[PDB]
Amino acid sequence: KFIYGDVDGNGSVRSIDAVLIRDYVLGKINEFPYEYGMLAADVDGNGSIKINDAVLVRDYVLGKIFLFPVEEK
Amino acid sequence: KFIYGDVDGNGSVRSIDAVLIRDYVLGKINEFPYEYGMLAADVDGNGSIKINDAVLVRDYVLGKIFLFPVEEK
Amino acid sequence: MLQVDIGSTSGKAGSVVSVPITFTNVPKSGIYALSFRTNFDPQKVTVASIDAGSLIENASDFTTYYNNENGFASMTFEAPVDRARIIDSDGVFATINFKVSDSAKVGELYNITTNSAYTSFYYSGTDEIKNVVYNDGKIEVIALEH
Amino acid sequence: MLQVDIGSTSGKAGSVVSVPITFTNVPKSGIYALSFRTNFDPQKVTVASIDAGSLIENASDFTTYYNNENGFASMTFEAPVDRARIIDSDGVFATINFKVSDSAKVGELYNITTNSAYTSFYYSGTDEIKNVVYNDGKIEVIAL
Ligand SMILES: [Ca+2]
Ligand SMILES: [Ca+2]
Numbered sequence: 001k002f003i004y005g006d007v008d009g010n011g012s013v014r015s016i017d018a019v020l021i022r023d024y025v026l027g028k029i030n031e032f033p034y035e036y037g038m039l040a041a042d043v044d045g046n047g048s049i050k051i052n053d054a055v056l057v058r059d060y061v062l063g064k065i066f067l068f069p070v071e072e073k
Numbered sequence: 074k075f076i077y078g079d080v081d082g083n084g085s086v087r088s089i090d091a092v093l094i095r096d097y098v099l100g101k102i103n104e105f106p107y108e109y110g111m112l113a114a115d116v117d118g119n120g121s122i123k124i125n126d127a128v129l130v131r132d133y134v135l136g137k138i139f140l141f142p143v144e145e146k
Numbered sequence: 147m148l149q150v151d152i153g154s155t156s157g158k159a160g161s162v163v164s165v166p167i168t169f170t171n172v173p174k175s176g177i178y179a180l181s182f183r184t185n186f187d188p189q190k191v192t193v194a195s196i197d198a199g200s201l202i203e204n205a206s207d208f209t210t211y212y213n214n215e216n217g218f219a220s221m222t223f224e225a226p227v228d229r230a231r232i233i234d235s236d237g238v239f240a241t242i243n244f245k246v247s248d249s250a251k252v253g254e255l256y257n258i259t260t261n262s263a264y265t266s267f268y269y270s271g272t273d274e275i276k277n278v279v280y281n282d283g284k285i286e287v288i289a290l291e292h
Numbered sequence: 293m294l295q296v297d298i299g300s301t302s303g304k305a306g307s308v309v310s311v312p313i314t315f316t317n318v319p320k321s322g323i324y325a326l327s328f329r330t331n332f333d334p335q336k337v338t339v340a341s342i343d344a345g346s347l348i349e350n351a352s353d354f355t356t357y358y359n360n361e362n363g364f365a366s367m368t369f370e371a372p373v374d375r376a377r378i379i380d381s382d383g384v385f386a387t388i389n390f391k392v393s394d395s396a397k398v399g400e401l402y403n404i405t406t407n408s409a410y411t412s413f414y415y416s417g418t419d420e421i422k423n424v425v426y427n428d429g430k431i432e433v434i435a436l
């Protein structure tokens with residue numbers, strides 16, 4: 001069980017989650033401190049964490065999109 | 074304290090230590106199984122772990138060299 | 147197609163040299179997000195600083211990180227959600243200022259390489275630019291000034 | 293200077309393509325040890341296998357590893373201590389067999405890049421080849 005976008009595992013998709021995905025892309029971190037952070041970060045569902053996952057999370061937080069591409073059925 | 078070449082910290086410089094350095098260069102491992110393995114691996118003393126540190130450890134185990142360049146020779 | 151160029155340069159042992167990262171044939175519709183990572187041999191050069199170039203109109207959109215033990219430098223651009231800033235023209239994206247090791251010998255060549263595993267370019271959050279070309283740079287160690 | 297080339301190639305979506313890693317202007321005194329690392333975007337291509345090229349005379353000298361999730365393939369060469377085998381002529385060091393994504397589209401370009409942080413070449417245990425030039429390669433997607 002996890003929420004897409006919730007890369008810190010705190011139960012909420014927030015601005016900082018997209019910062020954490022950017023830290024991974026930058027190489028500042030090599031893993032997420034949440035057991036499900038890798039799967040939560042991959043919001044386009046393509047199998048890799050990339051910069052557009054971070055901007056998708058930010059854009060969800062800001063209200064541009066209301067679901068992630070991995071959730072579209 | 075550590076023995077140069079003794080990347081697994083078991084007290085001896087052995088053929089497996091050179092294997093482990095090659096595994097680090099290849100990307101199979103991201104760290105050595107020893108608190109001081111990164112330091113013990115850098116046997117040419119250039120500050121980085123590279124493929125020639127592995128071949129140096131191999132050549133020392135095989136008796137081609139008798140000390141490591143970082144040991145002042 | 148979009149072309150990313152890592153410029154080549156030269157300098158003395160002990161010097162700071164600058165390597166520009168240039169984008170050519172940028173799509174006029176705009177790059178919304180990108181990451182760009184360069185590797186280098188960290189016992190030859192290390193990063194002193196990274197400076198955003200003229201393509202960055204607002205620092206909020208640009209983030210950098212480097213690791214001088216592991217030999218990489220990473221840059222990201224994220225346009226704001228309204229596309230109020232966007233990269234849609236050609237020019238310098240960033241410049242990496244590299245310290246050349248004081249033990250460098252004249253004639254050494256340091257490859258400053260684009261990392262395709264960590265470099266990607268997007269027209270929008272879901273649409274990737276999938277035909278970008280890269281041209282890597284080299285730093286040559288020289289004996290004389292300039 | 294020694295020149296390392298990652299070959300470019302093309303293929304269809306879903307195919308296996310073969311990317312050769314070539315050495316030109318190899319020092320006649322010999323390469324004693326090297327490592328070579330290529331990166332790629334694992335959404336675009338993944339490694340199926342890596343095959344030693346004709347510059348490898350004995351498999352005990354050559355070691356490979358790849359990690360598709362993290363987008364890299366690595367190879368090492370270590371000549372035996374008597375230099376009875378050594379790389380001292382030009383030719384193919386290795387070839388990487390890449391699976392092109394089933395979702396690839398015609399005209400996409402997938403760069404196969406040399407990683408300078410994990411690549412190095414040595415004349416001997418202590419004498420590095422410090423003027424080697426790396427040249428990268430591209431896989432182009434073509435139509436069926
Ligand atoms: Ca969260
Ligand atoms: Ca993704």
Ligand SMILES: [Ca+2]
Pocket residue numbers: 078079080081082083084085086087090
């Ligand atoms: Ca040991």
Ligand SMILES: [Ca+2]
Pocket residue numbers: 114115116117118119120121122123126
């Ligand atoms: Ca070393």
